[PDB]
Amino acid sequence: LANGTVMSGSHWGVFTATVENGRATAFTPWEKDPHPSPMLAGVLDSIYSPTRIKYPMVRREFLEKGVNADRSTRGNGDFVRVSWDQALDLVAAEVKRVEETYGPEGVFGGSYGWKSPGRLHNCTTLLRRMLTLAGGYVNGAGDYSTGAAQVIMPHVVGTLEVYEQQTAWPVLAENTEVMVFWAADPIKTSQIGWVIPEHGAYPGLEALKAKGTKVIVIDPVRTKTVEFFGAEHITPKPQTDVAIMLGMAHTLVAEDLYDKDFIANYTSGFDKFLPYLDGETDSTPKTAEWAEGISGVPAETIKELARLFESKRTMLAAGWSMQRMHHGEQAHWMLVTLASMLGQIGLPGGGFGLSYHYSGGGTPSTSGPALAGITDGGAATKGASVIPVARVVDMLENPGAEFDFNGTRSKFPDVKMAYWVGGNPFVHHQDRNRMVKAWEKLETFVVHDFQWTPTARHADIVLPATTSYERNDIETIGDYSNTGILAMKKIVEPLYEARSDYDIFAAVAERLGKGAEFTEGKDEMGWIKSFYDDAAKQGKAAGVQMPAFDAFWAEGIVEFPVTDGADFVRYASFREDPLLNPLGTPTGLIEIYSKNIEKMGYDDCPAHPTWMEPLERLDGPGAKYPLHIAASHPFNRLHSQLNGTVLREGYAVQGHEPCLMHPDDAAARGIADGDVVRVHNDRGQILTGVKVTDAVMKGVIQIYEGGWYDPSDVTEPGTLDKYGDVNVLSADIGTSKLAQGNCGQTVLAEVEKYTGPAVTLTGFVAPKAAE
Ligand SMILES: NC1=NC(=O)C2=N[C@H]3C(S)=C(S)[C@@H](COP(=O)(O)OP(=O)(O)OC[C@H]4O[C@@H](n5cnc6c(=O)[nH]c(N)nc65)[C@H](O)[C@@H]4O)O[C@H]3NC2=N1
Ligand SMILES: NC1=NC(=O)C2=N[C@H]3C(S)=C(S)[C@@H](COP(=O)(O)OP(=O)(O)OC[C@H]4O[C@@H](n5cnc6c(=O)[nH]c(N)nc65)[C@H](O)[C@@H]4O)O[C@H]3NC2=N1
Ligand SMILES: [Mo+4]
Ligand SMILES: [O]
């Protein structure tokens, strides 16, 4: 058996494995990693944990009755083990059946998910590759992270903006006077990357603190970001940031401080927004006093923040949680508007940034080539075919109905089958109880995972995939920085009967009479060497030298150099000469008023930043429930990933997902730290374990997304979730008609001490038949 050490990487970093007798015993972080993530140990554990899927399983119910099966028992664990040959025959037969009977419109292949890094083993791309061969599929658009923001930004600043390189960290260190983290926790969220992360924010953040720069954090939770800086902490009532931004704009007009020259030469439509702000259209002057009434943040604090921002070089780095809410589009729309009023856009250290908390945005880019991998075919091949990702349940329930998106109207397709790889829709999608009944509409549900997630438990057919550590691959290090290219080397042998997604899709393409079209005559290393060679020819033309494939593989990593990437300032050419370098909007300037959006006529998305009542907010007129659940991203998980590993022991409370509650709120309900609580609203009910702290502001509770749903009974509508899936409580509604994003953080609920029967958690052990 093997003994040695092997370097690879993941979403958490670059590391070195220790193999002892064919088993990975340790994962040590890369030596050049400036801030390793404590979650690496969990990543190793996920290879071997008890919820690891061993064999191909077919739902008992589906085996005997097929399309006539009772679809309400999905998730109950009654699975039949089958040979791989049987399972593959079944999946291909079923795919072809739905394509002949229903067409391409009957197959939903959006398969949303964070999967695993790697240009060869990209499961989601691989599934679309096979589905393209099978006749076609219905795809998904946008994502759950910036659902609202990515659609509205292009109407305002000209591009997406959220997934674009930021003004470099170094530039901030020498120039920024005030750093504002608005609804962002960069210490927490910078641990992972979409591709191998370099952890570039950490050094950037330390340079700021060493420099003495003033840092202001505007968030309901007392995060690690607040603690690292010992920052000034503004705690708004969740969902009231737009009011605050309006209040701050009012002061600025009220005391005549805003930058009139900036507004005049770089923006458009401001004079159509002024009336609104002054109260001339609705009789409600958007003052600090007015904003205080809605946000709960002292009026004078609001006036002082606005003055301090106008007289110092300020950077507003805003998170994305505040756009994962009803009317999400106004959050960043108002922040650009407020940034525009201060006049620092395009100045070194000033402006705003939407990616400083995500995937190393702000880390200087190198000049290395770009890496590419397997594609799904489409650019060389030949109802609606694309739906906004968060409208998947609506689709299912309303086949044929119309829907609005970015100014157009389309019809939902009539889907009969869902194929999901590398994602966890039974943990990530809002309103679990709505989705559970909606899934009954689907004839067949096929899932690939290596962990028995709530999504896998609910499948008709489940196939065991391997991790990234049981195969070979190549991937980039740094989403923005392009630090290097990594060889993701095989560590151990595929466990039990696990197989790569690629191998499973090759096999299914073969039964559709299309194998050579899927594989292209190449094997694993064949594909990897062709990606590397492509980048190497690219690098060569740009004067970046790169080893030959085997040389590169022997080293395992290639790093590229940094030339002028540490001097980059977002929006500097635009500010320097706006006529020569205009924005990509109709007017070519920052659009505070949108004629385009006004033409659309959407009630829930006016033509300028506007404050509207959300479906439900804390202390809102007629709100039924008292506490706001900050259903944010987890510290010790990557969404739902790593929940079924040893890491769960350090945060679970009585075996449940933790719930951070304020001492006053706990007293009132006679709740003691450590208790099991019932969290419920009109949508659903969950159990969690309480941690009492004054970190969370009064009126708000913290239950992170990612909890593995554990229903007491799948046949009982509204069954209590035993573990703690926060999406049992969220509502499933589009943000507005413009983007149709998800409102996953628009949740209100009530908490009580659980005094019911004892409960047995069953989600962290595999199904009896799967042992
Ligand atoms: N209430 C609410 N609040 C939120 O803030 C929130 N955040 C949202 C955001 S922005 C996101 S992007 C989503 C994420 O939801 P997402 O579906 O991306 O979640 P993951 O926990 O990363 O599940 C990915 C799955 O892929 C599996 N997997 C990984 N590699 C492979 C592989 O190669 N082969 C296959 N077959 N599978 C593998 C993992 O084991 C895991 O089960 O949640 C969203 N949902 C949210 N809900
Ligand atoms: N540790 C780790 N785990 C992850 O699961 C993870 N997910 C990744 C993904 S896909 C994405 S899309 C990004 C998302 O990064 P994103 O900005 O969406 O992060 P969140 O944790 O949902 O919210 C960040 C802060 O906003 C605060 N907040 C909540 N509601 C309000 C509000 O109404 N107003 C104010 N002012 N603040 C509020 C929260 O309390 C939280 O501290 O992070 C990425 N990074 C990740 N890191
Ligand atoms: Mo996301
Ligand atoms: O996402």
**CA 155 to ligand 1 centroid distance, Å:** 29
For residue 52, list its beta bridge partners: 451
* CATH number of the 52-143+376-471+497-519 domain: 3.40.50.740
Q: Which fold has domain 145-364+569-594?
A: Dimethylsulfoxide Reductase; domain 2 (3.40.228)
Residue type present at position 713? D
Pocket test for ligand 1, best of 11, 46, 144, 419 (most atoms within 8 A of CB): 144
Tell me the ligand closest to 236's alpha carbon.
2
Q: Are 434 and 140 in contact (CB under 8 A)?
A: no
Residue type present at position 454? P
Q: Give yes or no for residue 185 CB within 6 A of ligand 2.
A: yes
Q: Give yes or no for residue 357 CB within 6 A of ligand 2.
A: yes
Q: Half-sphere exposure of 33 toward its Cβ, with a 13 Å CA cutoff?
A: 25
**CA 146 to ligand 3 centroid distance, Å:** 7
Q: Give yes or no for residue 428 CB within 6 A of ligand 1.
A: yes
Q: Are 191 and 359 in contact (CB under 8 A)?
A: no
Determine which residue's CA is closest to atom 32 belonging to ligand 2.
Answer: 238
Contacts of 155 (CB under 8 A, 6+ apart): 585, 591, 594, 596, 597
Method used experimentally: X-ray
Give the C-alpha separation, 110 to 127, whole Å.
9
Q: Give yes or no for residue 702 CB within 6 A of ligand 1.
A: no
Name the residue among 19, 6, 10, 20 with its Cα closest to residue 40.
Answer: 10
**CA 144 to ligand 4 centroid distance, Å:** 4
Biggest CA-to-CA distance, the chain:
78
Residues after which the chain is discontinuous, using a C–N cutoff of 2.5 Å: 382
Q: Half-sphere exposure of 278 toward its Cβ, with a 13 Å CA cutoff?
A: 11
Answer whether 145-364+569-594 and 602-764 agree in fold: no
Domain boundaries, the chain: 3-30+472-489+520-560, 52-143+376-471+497-519, 145-364+569-594, 602-764
Contacts of 709 (CB under 8 A, 6+ apart): 426, 427, 432, 454, 721, 723, 725, 727, 728, 763
Atom nearest to 635 CA in ligand 2: 1
Tell me the ligand closest to 423's alpha carbon.
1
Contacts of 304 (CB under 8 A, 6+ apart): none
Give the C-alpha separation, 349 to 719, whole Å.
52
Q: Are 252 and 217 in contact (CB under 8 A)?
A: no
Within 6 A (CB) of ligand 4 lie 143-145
Expressed in Å, this structure's resolution amounts to 2.8
CA triple 167-171-173, angle to 5 deg: 125
Determine which residue's CA is closest to atom 34 belonging to ligand 1.
Answer: 422
Q: Which CATH class is domain 3-30+472-489+520-560?
A: alpha beta
Q: Are 284 and 276 in contact (CB under 8 A)?
A: no
Q: Which two three-digit tokens encode residue 69?
A: 């099966």
Name the residue among 16, 66, 68, 83 with its Cα closest to residue 44.
Answer: 16
Tell me the ligand closest to 660's alpha carbon.
2
3-state secondary structure of 630: coil
Q: Give yes or no for residue 744 CB within 6 A of ligand 1.
A: yes
Pocket test for ligand 1, best of 39, 705, 746 (most atoms within 8 A of CB): 705
Three-state secondary structure string covering 323-386: HCCCCCHHHHHHHHHHHHHHCCCCCCCCEEECCCCCCCCCCCCCCCCCCCCCCCCHHHCCCCCE
Report CA 66 to chain centroid distance, whole Å.
35
Q: Which fold has domain 602-764?
A: Barwin-like endoglucanases (2.40.40)
Q: Give yes or no for residue 641 CB within 6 A of ligand 1.
A: yes
How many Å is the Cα radius of gyration of the chain? 26
Q: Are 689 and 655 in contact (CB under 8 A)?
A: yes
Contacts of 455 (CB under 8 A, 6+ apart): 420, 423, 424, 425, 426, 427, 447, 449
- Torsions phi, psi for 457 (to 5 deg): -60, -30
**CA 632 to ligand 2 centroid distance, Å:** 5
**CA 638 to ligand 4 centroid distance, Å:** 11
CA triple 86-91-95, angle to 5 deg: 150
Instruction: Cite the active site residues.
Output: 112, 114
| Residue numbers belonging to the annotated binding site | 112-116, 145, 188-189, 218-219, 239-241, 320-321, 324, 424, 428, 448-449, 471, 501, 633-634, 639-641, 727, 744-745
Q: Which two three-digit tokens encode residue 495?
A: 């466990």
**CA 612 to ligand 3 centroid distance, Å:** 25
Pocket test for ligand 1, best of 428, 458, 461 (most atoms within 8 A of CB): 428
Q: Which two three-digit tokens encode residue 188?
A: 């927490």
Give the C-alpha separation, 454 to 75, whole Å.
7
